[PDB]
Structures are given as C-alpha cells and as structure tokens.
Write a protein that binds this ligand. Structure first.
Ligand SMILES: CC(C)(COP(=O)(O)OP(=O)(O)OC[C@H]1O[C@@H](n2cnc3c(N)ncnc32)[C@H](O)[C@@H]1OP(=O)(O)O)[C@@H](O)C(=O)NCCC(=O)NCCS
Length: 184
C-alpha cells in the first residue's frame, strides 16, 4: 500500500489532484532558477508529478507530498525514488526533496528526510540510500551532509539522462547505510 509517514510537524502522504496546482506554483516561482536553468510550466510540473505517482503506484513508496497540519495542505515533497538509470551506484534507492521557499529555514526538509530514512532502514530494510545534485546546489548537498550522508569526490559522475554539453551534467554522490543511520 502507499505508505503514509508522520514527523512531529509534517504528514508525508500520497499526492492528491489539488497538489498539482500548489506544485505548479512552486515550480513557476523565479526562486527555482537558483536550482534549475528555467522555471517550469504546468505541463512540465505535471510531467514530474506523473513520474512520482507512477513510482508510488508501481512500488508503494515514493517522494511523499509534504502536508503541514495547522498551516498548509502541501509545501513540496521529500522521499525515496528507485535509481534504475545506468550509473556505477545503480541499482539503488535515492532520497530527494523540493520545498516551497516560504517553508525554508525551519528544518522541515531535514524533518521530512529523517522520517523518510527512518522508513527506508526500519521498514524497507534497505542496505543504503543515496542522494545526488550538482556542485553549486549548496542548499541540497548541505542537507545531505547534515543528515549524516557522506560524499566521496572520487564518485562524481556525469548524469546519463542529460546530454553531454548540459551544464548540470556533473553530479556529486552522497551515501548513508543502515549502520551509520543508527549512530544518530
Ligand atoms: C534543499 C532544501 C530542501 C533545503 O531546505 P532548508 O529549509 O534550507 O533545509 P532544512 O530543512 O535542513 O533546514 C535548515 C535551515 O533551517 C534552520 N533551522 C531552524 N530550525 C531548525 C531545526 N530545528 N532543525 C534544522 N534546521 C533548523 C537552519 O538553521 C537552516 O538555516 P540555514 O539554511 O540558513 O542554514 C530547499 O532549499 C529546496 O527545496 N530547494 C530546492 C527548491 C526547488 O528545487 N524547487 C523547484 C520546484 S519545481
């Protein structure tokens, strides 16, 4: 079944149709040009939600919609995605996050990620979870290292789903294993 998880503040849940509106708004915001070359139109936003909902439908877990009881129905997503692409560290499971700027600076992505990794190791019994981003995305790989995920620069890779001359091609790899997760 589609796993519903609970943080102290956050509800990690399956996506609803109403979430597409809120996600599209996030992805149209000029502040996303810090992370992406250009803002997303509704068709692009909807294309990613389709991938998320496909993953949930096929696997029973995925990047959970973030509900904040007392505040907002949807502030972004955080959760697990199967790595199936042809890279050195695949097959494995990655953790990813996209938060509305209004909810930055509150440890909410931190809380969401801890809840997802608790699920990853205690429930799914995964040997490891990975994360990857571009070198300039300090906010994203900052959260990875604050979670206790660790990077080997030797494991830097070209993203095989991006063309050769794509500026974001070069990615850095973070890992956390069941063992290191228990140490917190
Ligand atoms: C990567 C991302 C999730 C990080 O979010 P964040 O809120 O900065 O990260 P955290 O949840 O770990 O919170 C850490 C911050 O909260 C603060 N904080 C306050 N209380 C805290 C607490 N109890 N625990 C942790 N941090 C806390 C920290 O001091 C830190 O502030 P800082 O960034 O100035 O150092 C966010 O920047 C993001 O989603 N970016 C991508 C957006 C995007 O791609 N959108 C496109 C949509 S299509």
């Amino acid at each position: 079944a589609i796993s519903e998880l609970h943080g102290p503040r956050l509800l990690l849940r399956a996506w609803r149709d109403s979430d597409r509106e809120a996600f599209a708004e996030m992805c149209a915001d000029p502040q996303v040009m810090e992370f992406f070359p250009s803002v997303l139109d509704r068709a692009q936003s909807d294309a990613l939600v389709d991938r998320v909902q496909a993953h949930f439908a096929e696997r029973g877990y995925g990047p959970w919609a973030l509900e904040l009881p007392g505040e907002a129905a949807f502030i972004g997503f955080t959760g697990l995605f199967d790595v199936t692409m042809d890279v050195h560290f695949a097959p494995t499971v990655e953790i990813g996050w996209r938060l509305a700027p209004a909810y930055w600076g509150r440890g909410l992505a931190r809380e969401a990620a801890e809840t997802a990794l608790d699920f990853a190791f205690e429930r799914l019994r995964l040997p490891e979870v990975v994360a990857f981003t571009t070198p300039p995305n300090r906010r994203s790989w900052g959260l990875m290292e604050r979670l206790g995920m660790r990077r080997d620069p030797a494991e830097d890779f070209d993203h095989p789903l991006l063309a050769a001359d794509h500026p974001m091609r070069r990615h850095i790899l973070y890992r956390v294993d069941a063992a290191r997760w228990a140490e917190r």
